[PDB]
Amino acid sequence: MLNTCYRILGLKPTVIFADQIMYTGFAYAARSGASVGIDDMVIPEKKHEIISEAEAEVAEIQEQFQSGLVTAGERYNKVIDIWAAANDRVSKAMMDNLQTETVINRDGQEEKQVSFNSIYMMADSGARGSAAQIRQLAGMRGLMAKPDGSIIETPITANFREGLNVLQYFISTHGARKGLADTALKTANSGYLTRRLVDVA
């Protein structure tokens, strides 16, 4: 919207327009009283089900490993897939529940529309957080990998609205530290790259 204003009216009007957007957006945002409480982070009703299914899927590939149907190195990447899938099921489960399930009526019978749940309004608009991060609040938060890089064959089954336990947090540790370590260097790498580029231009 701001873009088209520029290419039609010119610099000056776009500038003062953009002011009006900020002033008003802030004002009505305050009137809205949008917030976030514990009950805003709605877990799917099916979560515990989805786990036990892919958890039994590992019980299949386990039976085959002990009974020699499948090999050992094979079995690691088999289980890691049936877990990696269930996470995509849990993710698009909460996202179906959270998105539209405010079911409300107009004079006649029943109808459903995009939810007005607090934490949802934030992501759909783009103000902050993404289904990726949301996936760690309501649904389980992915699989982590040990310092190796080799992603561990029993994912973090808990989310942030629930607790994590001893081990789950300790597994979450590596990715966080390498995260910090990397972005400390990924800052240096940008810096060096841009430096080299201006020297030649």
Partner 1 sequence: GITKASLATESFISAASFQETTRVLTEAAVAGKRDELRGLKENVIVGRLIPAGTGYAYHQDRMRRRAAG
Partner 2 sequence: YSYTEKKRIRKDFGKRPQVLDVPYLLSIQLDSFQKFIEQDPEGQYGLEAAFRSVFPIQSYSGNSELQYVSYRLGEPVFDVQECQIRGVTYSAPLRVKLRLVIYEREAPEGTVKDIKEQEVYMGEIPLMTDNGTFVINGTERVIVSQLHRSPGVFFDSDKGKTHSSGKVLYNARIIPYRGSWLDFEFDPKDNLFVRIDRRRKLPATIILRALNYTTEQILDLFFEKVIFEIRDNKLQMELVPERLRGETASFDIEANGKVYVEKGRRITARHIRQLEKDDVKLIEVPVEYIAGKVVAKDYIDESTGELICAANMELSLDLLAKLSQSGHKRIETLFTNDLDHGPYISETLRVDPTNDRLSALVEIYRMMRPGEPPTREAAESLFENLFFSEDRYDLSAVGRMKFNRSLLREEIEGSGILSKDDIIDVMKKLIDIRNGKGEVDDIDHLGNRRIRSVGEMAENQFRVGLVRVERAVKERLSLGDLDTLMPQDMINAKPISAAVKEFFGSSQLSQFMDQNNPLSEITHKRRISALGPGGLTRERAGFEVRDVHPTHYGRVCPIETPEGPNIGLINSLSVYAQTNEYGFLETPYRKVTDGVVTDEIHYLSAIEEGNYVIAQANSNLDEEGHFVEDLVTCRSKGESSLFSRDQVDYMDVSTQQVVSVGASLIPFLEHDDANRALMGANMQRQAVPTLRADKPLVGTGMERAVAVDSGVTAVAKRGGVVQYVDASRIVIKVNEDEMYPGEAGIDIYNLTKYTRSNQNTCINQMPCVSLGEPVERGDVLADGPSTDLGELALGQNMRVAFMPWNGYNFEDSILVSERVVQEDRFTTIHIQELACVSRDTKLGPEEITADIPNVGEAALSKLDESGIVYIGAEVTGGDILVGKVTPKGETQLTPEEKLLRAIFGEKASDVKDSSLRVPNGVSGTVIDVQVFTRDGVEKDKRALEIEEMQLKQAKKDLSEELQILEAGLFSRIRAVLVAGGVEAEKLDKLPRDRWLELGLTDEEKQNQLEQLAEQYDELKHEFEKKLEAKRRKITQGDDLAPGVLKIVKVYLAVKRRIQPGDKMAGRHGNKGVISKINPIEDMPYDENGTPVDIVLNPLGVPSRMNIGQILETHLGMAAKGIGDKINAMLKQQQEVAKLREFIQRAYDLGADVRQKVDLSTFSDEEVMRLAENLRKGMPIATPVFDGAKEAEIKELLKLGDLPTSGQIRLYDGRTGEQFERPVTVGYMYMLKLNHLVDDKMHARSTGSYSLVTQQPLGGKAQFGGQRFGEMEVWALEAYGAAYTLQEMLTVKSDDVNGRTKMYKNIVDGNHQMEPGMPESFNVLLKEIRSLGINIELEDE
Partner 3 sequence: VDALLDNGRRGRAITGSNKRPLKSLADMIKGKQGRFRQNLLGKRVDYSGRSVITVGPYLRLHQCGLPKKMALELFKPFIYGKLELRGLATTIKAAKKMVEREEAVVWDILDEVIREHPVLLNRAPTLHRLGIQAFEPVLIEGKAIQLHPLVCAAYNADFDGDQMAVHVPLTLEAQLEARALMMSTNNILSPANGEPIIVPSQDVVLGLYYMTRDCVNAKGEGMVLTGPKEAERLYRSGLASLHARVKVRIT
**62 makes contact with partner 2 (CB under 8 A):** no
Residues 10-49 close enough to bind partner 3 by CB under 8 A: 11-12, 14-16, 18-19, 21-29, 31-32, 34
Amino acid at 67: S
User: What does the per-residue mask of binding to partner 3 show for 131-150, with x meaning CB under 8 A?
Assistant: --------------------
CB 89 → ligand G4P: shortest distance, Å?
Answer: 17
Task: Name which of 48 and 178 has its Cβ closer to partner 2.
Answer: 178
User: Could you tell which of ligand G4P, partner 1, partner 3, none binds residue 81, using a CB distance below 5 to 8 A set by kind?
Assistant: ligand G4P
Task: Name which of 150 and 165 has its Cβ closer to ligand G4P.
Answer: 150
Using CB under 6 A, list all residues that contact ligand G4P. 73-74, 77, 80-81, 150
Q: Using CA atoms, how far apart are residues 136 and 99, in angstroms rounded to an integer?
A: 16
User: Could you tell which of ligand G4P, partner 3, partner 2, none binds residue 52, using a CB distance below 5 to 8 A set by kind?
Assistant: none
Amino acid at 3: N
**Among 1, 30, 166, 200, contact with partner 1 (rule: CB under 8 A):** 200
Q: Using CA atoms, how far apart are residues 145 and 152, in angstroms rounded to an integer?
A: 5
Single out the residue of 157, 170, 166 nearest to residue 58, CA to CA.
157
**Among 34, 69, 103, 114, contact with partner 2 (rule: CB under 8 A):** 34
Which chain residues interact with partner 1 by CB under 8 A? 196-197, 199-200
